[PDB]
Design a binder for this molecule. Structure first.
Ligand SMILES: [Ca+2]
Ligand SMILES: [Ca+2]
Ligand SMILES: [Ca+2]
Ligand SMILES: [Cl-]
Ligand SMILES: [Cl-]
Ligand SMILES: [Cl-]
Ligand SMILES: [Cl-]
Ligand SMILES: [Cl-]
Ligand SMILES: [Cl-]
Ligand SMILES: [Cl-]
Ligand SMILES: [Cl-]
Ligand SMILES: [Cl-]
Lengths: 252, 252, 252
């Protein structure tokens, strides 16, 4: 129940340097492995830097605010190279970068294939995150994965808004439960059925010997629109009512 | 009126394996073609895998919920290699993957350049999607494009909220149409002019021989704020009114 | 206070052609430099095209609407190649592309390393943007960066909605300030504390010798829910009230 970001192709990767394109970040996913044919080179089972110093990195980014819950690193699958320690940096606004845990040096790998996982408690909240290898065996070469919370069903909703009124004297006389429907068409048709929230912004109504009774309900909601049912009861004479509505479409 | 996702650089791609970086997913867009100079190799006109089996794939992903309406595949431009059938997998939450149409094997290409397009009715709703070649002529090599519905103008809106009241006895006396304006400044200035929806959460008002009359309108909306015009008429004495507002900025 | 898009790995890049993968767009970031070791080739300090004509490009894209404020270009770090002029194209909807400033040819670089920056007034509003080199010294080779406004704290909010009523005669008798709390649980727990906006959609209440007094407040908001405090005062007998609420979570 966390998301493997690289496995799902959710993040753009950018390395500092690449030994060459056959050692690029595209070869860096956790457990990456390619042909065992020893007669041809189809790429390192790792990202491998070109320059060996303490300034190399891979930046992983996208526009969404991610809640990173863990990172896993691994050495290189096909040669004895691995990152033995690293630092992490991240940014929420893509302008100001901070060091994870005050520049903590994280102890990492000691062989080609064993996975080392660090859990973030609390999650790192970031748009971009960078692994900054500090020490290495033989070469700065690694495979990795970044784990994030799944997107919530309530995130990134679509919204259309409008207003609706009775607009005449339909409810301005009579006795007992009395209702009128105003059909509202959304400016644009939704892809799926939204919810429709409403709030009153005008009352022009007579009490029934002091009792005020008015109600609005959004009903018969479709992708194209909905009905605002205006309601009164007892003997109230309602002259006009106005609602603003906010139609919200989730998960689409 | 569909979006060519790869052409527009909207999706991250990740292959299972690459024959080498000069056969990577970066060379996989539909109709990809490079130099005709036979004296140098600038890359295959295809993604080409390294391992030939039924387990290769390209994953295409991003954070947004896409509605995929079609996929097109093509063989390799510069050699006689093409995928002859494939399966599709996808995921909406990036945790749970499903097979398209119960693992349907889709019949695909039979030459280098002819495009084979499959239409999805209904659209596949997904954050990530993967093509899983099953059979091939000579090598797992392909070019492709994924077509999605365009983003709606109502998607990803920006929102600020607040409340506003009369806050004094400005409307608590008098006859005829009577109005007061409260100017509201948004916590942060918007990039473009929002809409402003409102809903009443407090009425403290006297009826005019039984008739209740109150209204609020948001007016003079700018990037920086708006005016809440509080309104009464007839002889109503309105002591206070409060609205919550929801300012929504679209398409920005 | 602008965002360096490529530095932060925020955009997918796609070139028209690459001299080969060691001259790909992955080597195109502004100021990109790799090993100075003259004995091995770890890639060009540039993207370099394969075909030399007026039809080459790099497309930079993602789903988010960006407000691009500037572009910077540079020639190739390790050889005497640079783009001397280019055009820009962009798209907001990823269907319809437009030429920047009526197809203006922008004067660009004249050496390997000096940066040439063009500022966009007003910002270019786009999901994808493409640099289209027109003329070049020796080869179409460049490094570049795209600068965008930072994301606003109000963008991409998460939203849950619902309704709440008194649902009994708790406020239907008595004198003075009288309140009841209805606890609302959000359908799903938020990651951080939201704001909760409310709007009345039903009044069933008696005036107090003509004075109407009712109020709702959202209070004690947590990640899990909030309290709708229903309020009356004076001697009003309130039979029922209903609010719709819109809970909005920012920056998460
Ligand atoms: Ca190998
Ligand atoms: Ca060629
Ligand atoms: Ca070099
Ligand atoms: Cl160093
Ligand atoms: Cl070794
Ligand atoms: Cl009745
Ligand atoms: Cl197999
Ligand atoms: Cl051939
Ligand atoms: Cl009047
Ligand atoms: Cl030309
Ligand atoms: Cl030179
Ligand atoms: Cl009182």
């Amino acid at each position: 129940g966390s998301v493997s970001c690289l496995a799902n192709a959710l993040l753009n990767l950018r390395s500092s340097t690449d030994y060459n394109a056959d050692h690029g970040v595209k070869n860096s996913i956790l457990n990456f492995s390619n042909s065992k044919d020893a007669s041809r080179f189809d790429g390192s089972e790792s990202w491998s830097s070109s320059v060996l110093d303490k300034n190399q990195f891979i930046v992983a980014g996208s526009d969404s605010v991610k809640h990173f819950v863990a990172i896993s690193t691994q050495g290189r699958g096909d040669h004895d190279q691995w990152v033995t320690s690293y630092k992490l940096r991240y940014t929420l606004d893509n302008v100001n970068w901070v060091e994870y845990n005050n520049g903590e040096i994280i102890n990492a790998n000691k062989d080609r294939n064993s996975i080392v996982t660090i859990n973030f408690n609390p999650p790192i909240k970031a748009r971009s995150i960078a692994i900054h290898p500090q020490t290495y065996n033989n070469h700065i070469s690694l495979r990795w994965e970044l784990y994030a919370l799944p997107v919530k069903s309530y995130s990134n909703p679509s919204v259309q808004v409008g207003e609706v009124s009775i607009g005449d004297r339909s409810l301005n006389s009579g006795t007992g439960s009395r209702t009128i429907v105003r059909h509202v068409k959304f400016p644009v048709e939704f892809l799926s059925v939204p919810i429709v929230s409403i709030g009153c912004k005008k009352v022009d109504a007579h009490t029934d010997n002091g009792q005020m009774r008015w109600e609005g309900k959004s009903e018969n909601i479709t992708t194209k629109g909905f009905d605002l049912t205006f309601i009164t009861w007892g003997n109230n004479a309602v002259y006009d009512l106005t609602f603003d509505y906010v139609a919200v479409e989730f998960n689409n």
